[model samples]
Target: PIETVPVKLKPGMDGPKVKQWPLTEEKIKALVEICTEMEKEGKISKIGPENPYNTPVFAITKWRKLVDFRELNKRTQDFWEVQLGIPHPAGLKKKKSVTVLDVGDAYFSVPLDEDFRKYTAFTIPSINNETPGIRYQYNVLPQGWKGSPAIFQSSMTKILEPFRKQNPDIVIYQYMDDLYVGSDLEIGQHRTKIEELRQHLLRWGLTTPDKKHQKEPPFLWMGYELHPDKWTVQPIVLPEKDSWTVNDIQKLVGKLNWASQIYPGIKVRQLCKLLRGTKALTEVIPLTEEAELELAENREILKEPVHGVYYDPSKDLIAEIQKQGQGQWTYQIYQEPFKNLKTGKYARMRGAHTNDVKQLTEAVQKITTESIVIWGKTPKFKLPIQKETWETWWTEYWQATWIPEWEFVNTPPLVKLWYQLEKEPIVGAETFYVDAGYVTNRGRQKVVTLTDTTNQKTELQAIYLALQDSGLEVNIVTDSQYALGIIQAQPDQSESELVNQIIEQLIKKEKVYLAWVPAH
Candidate 1:
């Protein structure tokens, strides 16, 4: 191992150099071994010796480990120029060229720095660290790290500094692993950008294997399909295909959890049970029609209509409503109003992650690609969508009740959970530990609630005997009252009893402190 480190932090630094250090052969071998293990687990069929495609295929799994799928092209400067029929898609010359330089996690065998142990095993790193191990890890992306994509992009960005400074018009957005590079759909400037990007990756010691590459019309990004010509997102991967394995099932469950975000406190223990089965070293059964239906129901619940443009016509709509005797109404009927905020107006806003205004411009450029030339804009300047039945009801309720009460002007009834909002203090204080016990059968689920005001923390032993006296289920939680009480109370009572049952046994060995916290 060499002693002296390579770089330092200074203002206006591009980023860490991609080839600043070389990875040990052992580390590379370890990564390859992990990749092979993951591939076998994913049920991915390997490319044969006689195969035409050059890149390898790793099976997609529920526990699908995040591996870098580098794209390779036939040896030609104009490689991407020809239409490449592949699974992953790239932009056509006509589409705006946007390159999103996202960073994701890369776990290295050796620590990036001598004192790296001081930091957590996994974390987002500061861009200026001189660590050569870090650069080598970036060039060879690993499985299961979230920050690998951004690291790859940032490191590549530094290596391509010469081209980047010259081409200020090129767009880059680093949204996690998904990248969006935008240029005008009219010109072929995007082609130049693509070649430049590929060459730059090579110069930076990164290689793209061809088989994992794609240039089809529908390229997948962050679970959405990007059309070759526009900014619209479509669901392209089917659930069956996605849930083909344990890891894939887990990932799908995670996606399901994300979709269920709109439904606060909704528990799908059926899904969790499936995931736990996998975690406990078992195979997940293929989902049934009923299972898919169960998942779809939640999806539909979250699928509110995407608002489009609305037009107001003459119904004397407000007056017509009063005539219909839709209760007493306070109507604001005006002709064109003092001003109208036009829909689909083109305005350049900022990117969420990148402080670079260039990303913001790229976003605007994407929306304006299908611009209505005569209107001098696109959907970015679109009008507000017409009210759906649900929205109309809300509007009417607001106008009649909320307007009079000035509810909308101040506080309104919010259905969404305020995750960041702190909860108010609970009405009363209580600290008691309950014994979470288990039965021999192992599948029974039960809830135990302790209402005692005593320090159940100390009385946990007594609670355990009381639980054993009942002889109902397995004992859970050795350490804390909170986890025990949570199991007993089933605070949400929202999940399947099966989950409660399993949790009963699981908690017997674990410790969770159930606290009386404030509720919002």
Candidate 2:
């Protein structure tokens, strides 16, 4: 047996030396054994010949940037809330450190199931001095394969499950092969702790590169800059050119969005709109005055000293106004202005998680018992109708009573359709049916007959019918409270099962708008 080590070749840097490793019988046998072992483990399976159009599919592109766990993605906020504790308070003398261990060729280390390996087979034109073409498939995971990151993560989780259970105090966050061992415990024990973790990985046959192994200050992991002096995870500001084009502005907004995950104070949404005026790369528009000012302001905000605070549920207020799904809840933060009392003031905070009726009715119990006004701000004072809730009531009040001056505001024109639904029981027998008559400004009139027995269904059916008839966009006028309630919900809020089913069918075609008209 001869000792051999696999080394990566950089053609340009290393100067090409035309040498080939022999495909020895021993190597082939070893690979075959490995594939056999992988098959037994159910990591791969056999499949019939490939069908046309079934090349390969990956959710993320090769050019797609590595996603950061620290930066808020669609799911990051929910994940942090449930899985992680509040970050340590800033300015505390506690020495917090992290050691990052990146596994070498992580994807190749994971075993691939036989089925997936079937497509991975390739034929070598020649090996050593022989011109023998032999087909060999990978028994282990390959880079560029779809769902590799997920598989690598899950595998690492199981591998490190023991260490996690043994030392609960030390926080270990692993993604794929990038492992971070964090500790707010003893300062001196950090190096020792990291060393122990390094040995544990070695025992599991996980090899980490020496250069990438980080065990000191300025340790970076998951795209977050974790400096020893800074308690909060800071976003990595990417270098940008001085003269930014329209596309650059769009890219800048994305960077800010990622940064906002850590700060949550950056208003990237408005910044994004500034670039919407032009989307063409060739017809680049210089950054608007407002965008430049905003960029400067955001930089200043990020520069301000901020630290991660331990989460205290008591100190932080949260009211889940709507549930997008079973476990997915949406809340109105205090930062959002609640109501325009028109008294020149509004009830809201910089970061308030606030609550609404119809919208509120779903969340609250025994609605009559709860007063919807602020009685006092004295001892033990709390408003029943909070920030998110105020939006619903204020919207209703605004539409009901509007100033003449507000009409002068240049609102975008919309194709308006007015509809009225009538449901009455058949003369003697207790059977109710509805007939909906709708009219558009284009002098088009349509009537829909619905068999629904309820007022809500009748109103909803009319709106659905109008939506179907309308083009890309249309605003519907309805007097029915049942329909308005369903329509008025925040865009992301989950709807009733029936309404949800109708929405699934409608949104597949066009955009829908709903406006209320008093039925008096």
Candidate 3:
């Protein structure tokens, strides 16, 4: 049988027999019926008395019982380092018609050998009648087995290998029991392939749910809504106001973790940092000031269908970074405007993010080496000497693995191709360059058509409005040191509207900087 490798306990380790949670009468009847019916099908069997081991099992919900395999999971040896079929769905294949299908009781499709069966035995505790409590072992693979997912994943992949070749035109992907059959065929044809796959799985002893399948776009798969064009976040509820346990917070993170890839700029990582610092998974965690801000940012992003930047790899990628807090950073690979099939216009999208500078550089390197030209942004001074024009944090590459020599573009309007540098970039304080007419970064531009005020005053007004609206530790760079000097040299009695307002704005910031650059 193309089933699981036999589960073996660590040498000299025995059964944990962890105690199961007590069950209600209704729950008892349901679980007994499930075990008995499964037993008759050779999916479960009664264990003989004096068995050395027993893994506790009880119902979490009314119908389904979960086994306590924590102790056994720890003692069991992890084997087989084969590739997992599940890649983060960000990289999920983008065929026009992909359907998500689920296999009912997925783990049970594969059976255990006689020797492994006793290891899965659990007590069906005695009742009020003269009937005796007995141990019932799983004949098939049980839920909560550490090895179950990988084993099930492999078996399904193995069975589908033949199916994949037979229907080579149609693409099928399996994440354990969940199947995503995608193709560029007609609506009915894609559905036909999904049904064909279901039949294919049934012949291998697995059953697909009748109603779990969807017939159209916006198909939900692994916490992502897959549309006809771009992939987006699955709809999620906002966090509760008063209190949330660690596990509650974890569930919140878990729900958004998959979508977090689509938004590396968002601070879901901070929420995870808070979770890691947590002492107990069940303990109540208050929404700290920083945690609350991150939560809000994530919520705002989810409210719109503004997740996942669908871009063609043939286009240039922008590599940039966002600071979460002190000593913490996240880097994002960006793609822009290539007839986003969903929008049919030029647009921008972010690539990916990870925890540190090291692995992220490696990821960037891996992508660049694949011949996809990437544009990384950093300040000009951060660039390598002599080749200083087009560069970002390529020095960080020295901090990581071997650096590759990049072909520099010395053509007209110089797109120096090493790592594209954006010329006063920063971390904590977001730097903005403002003149009378415009602010260089982020949003909005105004043409001062009504030059009603003095040139110096207009420049100061632009700085004033920028500081008033933005949340970051405001850092303003200006050529108008004349207006800049007014804020710095505030007298005890002076009450100029622009100067005082700019002073108050600076006072409001925890960390503010007024940088002066020479004007033309």
Candidate 4:
């Protein structure tokens, strides 16, 4: 049965008919030959009543004619947005042998209605060579229609399902116009299934073009040839030039990258000069000695067959990675930079794929939320830290350099009772206001930018001086909170040598009034 697929237009898609571009007599002569040939085959036909739409046609080469279907295509909606999948290259290659089938003039084989065909109209020169020739439009689905391949693929796939159902083991792999037919079965078994399906394509009104459809060994599949056991690629052509332009080298390198997939030789050390030599990406330079070696290496190596490898599901897919210095440095050396003349060595883990890194972090956050579920808090416990030696000596009681990971402890945060102090005065109380200031150091003639630390240092010095003298009850007033806290802190809490010396001075005093004062 002719499974004619219908193409619908989107409501807003529209355009005026395209006028055919004028051509010289020689090209018109070629165009007419193609036009008449297609007309005879009933692929296109004469138009009537001067249709509102017509696209341009061009005769390109002897066996080629081109049509601009863009205008018509723009106005048409997709036919179910049909998608096609190819058999994984390795999937097909792993078979003992496979036969690939083609749909000759694939798009032209699909049927189209006259009403829809009118939209594909184009005009040619008249036979007399004097006037505009007859307007003609497609009678079948035409090439260059954007949705043609997808529609044909969808229809062809559906039509083959019965075959798939009956011979479930045949292993048909389709990609629009090509079919890969075979499996673990050898070539002899492949022919039996092929013969049954071959006859049915024509029975359903599609021409098989038998001679081209059945290929001999080194059988071509899709666009590549499957030679004996190892896959190989000898590039179609190598450009010969004494002076190559940057564009030529760039384009050549691009081609080699695809070739490298099969022939590893295409990616040789010599080849790197072509890309890395670019002071600017697109400038021309003569071949250097290294370039010559690489170019020669590729040509010589590629002259022979390349050992091409493909996907085999039985083998573990060893995904290779690159030497991107960012996350790859994960070892003992990672705690600090590898070259580590600088800092920045920290713990890091990378994404599985590039985006895998992102997905992992998102998963980590998800687990972080879930980590709170069904989890109980272990009550906070404390261990007296040992530093040994006093604030230097008393550290021995709490020794071990730092807290061990297996132990848990706490610190006595600042006391609020010391922050609020009530001052009481006696009639004979000797009160003193002592504070520090940023003043010019006459030795350096430098005005100090420091005020806080200097202020605290001076306030401590004032307390030290007052206690150094014989006094009834010394009272000190200062705005430095740092001086206030450190002066009153326990021996274990202090770090400063001056503060330690000041603590000793304080042990000798009867009473001292340390007060907090606001800076005005």
Worst 10 residues of 1 by lDDT: 317-326
Expressed as tens digits, the lDDT of each residue in 344-452 for candidate 4 is 1111343221221222223333322222221211111122222221123223222232211212123322111111122453335466555432211112111223445
| Candidate 2 lDDT score relative to the true structure | 0.45
| Residue 387 lDDT in candidate 1 | 22
The most accurate candidate by TM-score is 3
- lDDT by residue for model 3 over 1-520, one digit each (tens)? 4555577777898766766556677767878888888888878888777776778777764487677887778887785754543443434335767776778868778877566777777887766647756788877777777777777877888888998998888877666556767787888787787788888888877888653444566777666777655676677777657687898888887766655555443455556656766789788877777788888887887666665544443554444333334223333444453222121110111112111233323433544432232122221111112244212334522233443443332322222222111223445656677765556456555545344687767888888777776664666788887765555432111235666566556556655566789977
Clashing pairs in 3: none
State the C-alpha lDDT per candidate: 0.33, 0.45, 0.60, 0.54
Candidate 1 lDDT over 143-162, as tens digits, reads 33233333344454454566
Tell me which of candidates 2 and 3 scores higher on TM-score: 3
Candidate 4, number of clashes: 10
User: Worst ten-residue run, lDDT, model 4?
Assistant: 333-342
Could you list the CA RMSD of all candidates, in the order they appear? 21.6, 17.2, 15.3, 17.6
Question: Which candidate's lDDT is highest?
Answer: 3
Model 3 TM: 0.54
lDDT of 4: 0.54
Report the lDDT of model 2 for residue 504.
48
